[model samples]
Target: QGLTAGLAEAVRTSQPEHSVDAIRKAKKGLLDFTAASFAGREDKGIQKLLRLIEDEGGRPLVPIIGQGKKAAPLQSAMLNGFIAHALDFDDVHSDVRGAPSAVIVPALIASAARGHDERLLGAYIVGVEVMARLGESIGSRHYEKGWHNTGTLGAIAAACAVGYAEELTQEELEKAIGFAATQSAGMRVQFGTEMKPLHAGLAAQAGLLAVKLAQSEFGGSRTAFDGETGFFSLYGDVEKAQHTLLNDWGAPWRIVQPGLWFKIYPFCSAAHHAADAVRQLISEETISAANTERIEVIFPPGGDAALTERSPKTGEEGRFSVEYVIALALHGHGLTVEHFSSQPIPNGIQTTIGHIQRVYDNATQPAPHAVPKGRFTIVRAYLSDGRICEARVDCPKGAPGNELSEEDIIEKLTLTVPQEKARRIITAVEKADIKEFLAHIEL
Candidate 1:
């Protein structure tokens, strides 16, 4: 009774329609994210944080990707989130317009530790619901204003998932929500740099801390969301923020409605549709990179906001560059972690990237309430030989409308982990208990 009854009910009652699909997506993201951790072992940013944890004498309670030692629960959450998102290969959700699994999975594992394998999936469902609902309320106002939902709203969702996993009372859950609201932070300006992925890690860690504090009877404001100076007013445009605090909590699960986007390319999800279109156009026309005079990628209005880099100077920046992704597709370069991490891109690929340009279609700009499946762009290639090829994609692969198959997920798993480990991990996630699955999976 402390906060609105609708808030508590949403946290406790929102259930997933296709829980199995949700579970599969979570497992797929975990393995891939962990594999990314290994791939990023030499990354100065990751190494610096890992050393800091060790230097601070943090406990090794939770396992990190690609490392033998354990870290404290907070450290584990932060590190896991970072590793999962390090390569920008984590899953995406249209509702949040950011990656939620990166935040939820890391916090759930850190909070659940060795117990409650059965509740792991349930906790994830609840977390996603909370995150998506809040995102819906704030709508694009928050994101368009430069707040990265993956960190701000993602932390709130992570806390709810852990709180539910631990069986926190309704009162405690409300407090946890309040605590989460206070810790919300992250900005779009941080995109295209290490801080972008670091935001996910920080949210994961902050979420776990919020839940722990709530469990300890820490006090926080009850009206965290609807207050005059609360999250909506401070971080978002108050007039534009839809007050859905008590609306239909779970009429249709956001995970199933908008659903999650499983990325095949380790780049910004914003550029994915253009990448898909380009890949198809090149393959269908059998266009050679050398023959292409210029490549143009068109997106709906504001569709390319996340693709911050127009001309990438380094591999990391390339991930946020539509031109770079299109170029890789043209050069027949397999889009993988190495492509983004490998610096000094081949001269041919760089040349291709230079030929590509990004354009926006104002006529196709979509409203916030539009079905996410219809969001996409067009790719047009002009050949030097007076030939042109074009393709348009409204629904990219890995979206709910065009979902990735189990086999596709296995392919991603193989890319992330060793073949044997990938096999065992998949088998365990399907058949073993949560603890067994956790044990079977190593960096």
Candidate 2:
């Protein structure tokens, strides 16, 4: 059997009950993603895509949150996936360096809309398990080689979550996984564009279409991942990959164990370190933007690989640029939705961004780099007063090792939607039931 088939079987037979901690945490991940998506929905780009999806007007079923129109399961999943990721607020799995929200939450919401609540929890767990394992199994080679693991692995995981929720026959589920496998695609080349978030939407649409086609009796190759030309051998660096990770198949719920990294700020995960580090340095030294002459961001080697644009011209590009993000921190503005709005960077902020330079040190790993390990960023701020202050962070504030509190989670939500709406979400998530939340949502 190909890897996809084996993986599908893993989800079906695995009886490893998720730990209480993991289940509770996964719900928090869901809340974090929803808040981020809610914020992203306010963006013109996301709003435009939501409008386009609305114009298509499929059978109304799944809810669209702040938007009023209902769309088919596939459409709802796609729009919601996009909005959730539209901000970088989605949960991150450092093991895979891929965002999990694009795959998991959309599947959960769609499954619930289909009235499959009993399986809703299982579906969410499966999405995280498969996506996380797939990401780690292939290693960074999967992403560095041009595959957007978020989309590729996300589509496959979505297939499992949806197929399992719908309780399709094993034969049908396998084919749906295959259908999803064939459509899985995304690339890092689009990292700085609106297309980066679009990857999440495409993954959702692809997975939903796979299920739709499978239900209609369409045939898809069963050995899509394990075959000679399969996903494992072709897209992944299998010689260095570990099959054992998937062997125990569902032995433990990866989501609740390692847990997903919740974002406290909205920007590329790569940018978080520099943003935090610079913010710390500024606060400690009481540095003002006017007093700063030059700021140099020293990253561990290979750190700038993910986002190497030294002088980003646009806000979108700025999100990925270590220099610009560090500049945002130096100016005393940590990441915010407005930080990335289309408005041009002010002269002071722009000067800071310009002053920001990237340096490589052999002593540690690079900034903006993903596995074999997470990246660390060091910022050295040179002020006009000849004062020098530095801050180095191995892990950002909200990465796996460092977690956001439940109260912090609510604070994040209120920043995007109304406090009442945020409170309702927390209640629904804690209940692990979307009914009341869904009923109150405009979409």
Give the alpha carbon lDDT tens digit for every residue of 341-369 in model 2: 65677776777777778888887644443
Off by over 4 Å in 2: 238-245, 365-374, 441-443
Q: For model 1, what is the error of residue 411's alpha carbon versus the real structure, in angstroms, after optimal superposition? A: 1.2
lDDT of candidate model 1 versus the reference: 0.75
- Please report, as a residue range, the 10-residue window in candidate 2 with the lowest summed lDDT: 365-374
TM-score of each model, paired residue for residue: 0.91, 0.91
Candidate RMSDs in Å, in order, are 2.9, 2.8
Which stretches in model 1 have alpha-carbon errors above 4 Å? 1-5, 14-42, 237-242, 362-374
Per-residue C-alpha lDDT of model 1 across residues 239-331, encoded as one tens digit per residue: 544546446655555666677677778887777788788878767888768778998887777677778888786777888888888888778
